[PDB]
């Protein structure tokens, strides 16, 4: 029914509006920090010697 | 020094080998491309490469190496290569016809067994026909008539020339049937609305004849002591067919063209 869909939508909107939010700058900083802290562990980002690389 | 019209053999052989080895390297070398049509294209390329290499070696054998006994082996190699090239052209035409006439079932492995039979029937016949230039009554002692092409007796050369016409007639018939199918499709497509087919056939079925006929006719009609100029003058048309076969059967294909561009670019 239209009324049921409207009620469900309005509860969904209220739930999505009453949740906590933070500045986008903090999200960008978190992503940058995670990328920096894990850059020394991904062969894909920086090649590795064939001695240890399985695919070599 | 190699007299006039001798350099033409060398340059033609080099040009044939340059383009056909590339086709061989792509079709046989690169992954995939093992479909029966591509196997029969690779066989044609190998035959043309052998013909070009044989021509180049024969030019070296003429003056540089100067070995009289090497000339017979190189002539046998050249005969084998040309026979294999023409057999591969016939094999490609018969494969096209069989793909059009078993379109639904052409994609079965009954074809791979046929492609292998054709690849082994085309190369056994080439070997058998190129074995004659050594022994088997080929004017090594001069008893049997020779001279039309000195390292080959006239009888064997005439046999090769007649086999050429045998192949040409069958190719004409097969391409006539393919043109019938093409016309059937063309008349149908137009009706839904409101010539590339005949133009492509004019090359596919025309260049082969215009290239190989002069040498074959000379072989049938040429006498033993005919002027040497005729052998060379009619050899360039024959060798031309070997330097346009990759253009006709390999260059036009979209995927082969894609790989060729990737290598070149």
């Amino acid at each position: 029914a239209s009324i049921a869909q409207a009620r469900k939508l309005v509860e969904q909107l209220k739930m999505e509006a009453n949740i906590d939010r933070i500045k986008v700058s903090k999200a960008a900083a978190d992503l940058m920090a995670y990328c920096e802290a894990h850059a020394k562990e991904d062969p894909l980002l920086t090649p590795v010697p064939a001695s240890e690389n399985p695919f070599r | 020094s190699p007299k006039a019209w001798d350099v033409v053999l060398c340059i033609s052989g080099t040009l044939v080998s340059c383009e056909n080895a590339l086709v061989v390297a792509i079709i046989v070398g690169t992954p995939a491309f093992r479909a029966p049509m591509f196997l029969l294209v690779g066989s044609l390329a190998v035959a043309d490469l052998l013909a070009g290499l044989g021509l180049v070696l024969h030019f070296a054998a003429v003056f540089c190496i100067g070995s009289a006994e090497m000339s017979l082996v190189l002539v046998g190699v050249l005969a084998m290569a040309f026979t294999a090239s023409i057999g591969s052209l016939l094999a490609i035409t018969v494969d096209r016809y069989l793909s059009l006439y078993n379109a639904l079932t052409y994609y079965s492995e009954t074809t791979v067994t046929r492609t292998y039979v054709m690849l082994a029937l085309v190369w056994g016949g080439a070997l058998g026909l190129g074995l004659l230039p050594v022994l088997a009554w080929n004017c090594l002692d001069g008893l049997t008539t020779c001279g039309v092409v000195y390292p080959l007796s006239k009888n064997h050369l005439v046999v090769l020339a007649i086999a050429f016409f045998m192949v040409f007639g069958i190719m004409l018939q097969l391409y006539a049937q393919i043109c019938r199918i093409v016309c059937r499709h063309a008349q149908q497509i137009a009706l839904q609305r409101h010539r590339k087919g005949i133009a492509t056939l004019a090359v596919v079925l025309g260049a082969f004849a215009a290239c190989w006929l002069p040498f074959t006719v000379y072989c049938l009609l040429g006498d033993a002591h005919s002027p040497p100029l005729y052998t060379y003058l009619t050899l360039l048309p024959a060798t031309y067919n070997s330097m346009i076969n990759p253009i006709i059967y390999a260059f036009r294909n979209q995927d082969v063209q894609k790989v060729l561009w990737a290598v070149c670019c």
């Binding site: 969904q12 909107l13 999505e16 939010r21 986008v24 992503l31 940058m32 995670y34 990328c35 562990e41 | -």
Partner: protein
Amino acid sequence: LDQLRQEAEQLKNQIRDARKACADATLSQITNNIDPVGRIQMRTRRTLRGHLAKIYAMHWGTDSRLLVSASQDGKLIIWDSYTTNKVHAIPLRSSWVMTCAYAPSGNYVACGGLDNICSIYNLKTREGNVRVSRELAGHTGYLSCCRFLDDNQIVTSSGDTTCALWDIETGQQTTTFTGHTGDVMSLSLAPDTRLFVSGACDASAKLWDVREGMCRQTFTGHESDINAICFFPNGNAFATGSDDATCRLFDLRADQELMTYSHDNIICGITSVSFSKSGRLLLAGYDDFNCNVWDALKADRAGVLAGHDNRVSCLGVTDDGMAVATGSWDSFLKIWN
């Protein structure tokens, strides 16, 4: 009844205002002085081939050694990447398979597609072979993507705009998720296995909690449909492909779009997306059979893995980022490294 519509419109306006207020900066602006990646000259190192038809999905195990690939020819061949040796040739009841999974335990596999059934297979058997363990039905929608929570739980997303959680023991739909309007193209489990997002066909991406069983957020920053979803390694973000040729990145806490990747030369939609181990790279496959390695920070292309034909069905990454499998419709799985 119109009062409900007015209230919904006011709530949407409030959400927009809150997002604008929280939009104090952008990822592109922040990354104006970050170290560029440069150019990554990755080349194919292992062409598995073998597959008899166009591939549509693939996923590896926890040990990053054995990989499971699913193709629309009905084969689920398991390959040993190190030596290329095949380990199994699990046939599939339904030829059309759009997804597959490899359980963390390393012995259970599952797949599904237009058959509407998420078949389950176990590699460990008394006969040393693979036999059907359980078939999950009752979805009324083609399975777009599935994942393994553990050796006894599987979560699947169908085309009916609903995601469902199943229990292998009793084969029952323990929890059901709903709220989307378009087809759910894909989902990606979080590293903690608690949260997981899903990209609907209507450009709306929603986050759900498996235990709670209800949605939490909704992102509608895409102008067209979303083709693939992949969770960030840190478990707080996820990339989003689309048919409009634009890739975007969202953050759960941000609650809004942060970055968008697109170029004038690119006019082709993205088929699949998968983040790298470190999360600094955003590999994606395009409709022009030309995979591109985007940068999550610079947003500039970091390299093109050309070589696939007619599509790039799906990508993949390891638990340690040791190799990438680039599935394609050409039936060849090329492992780049």
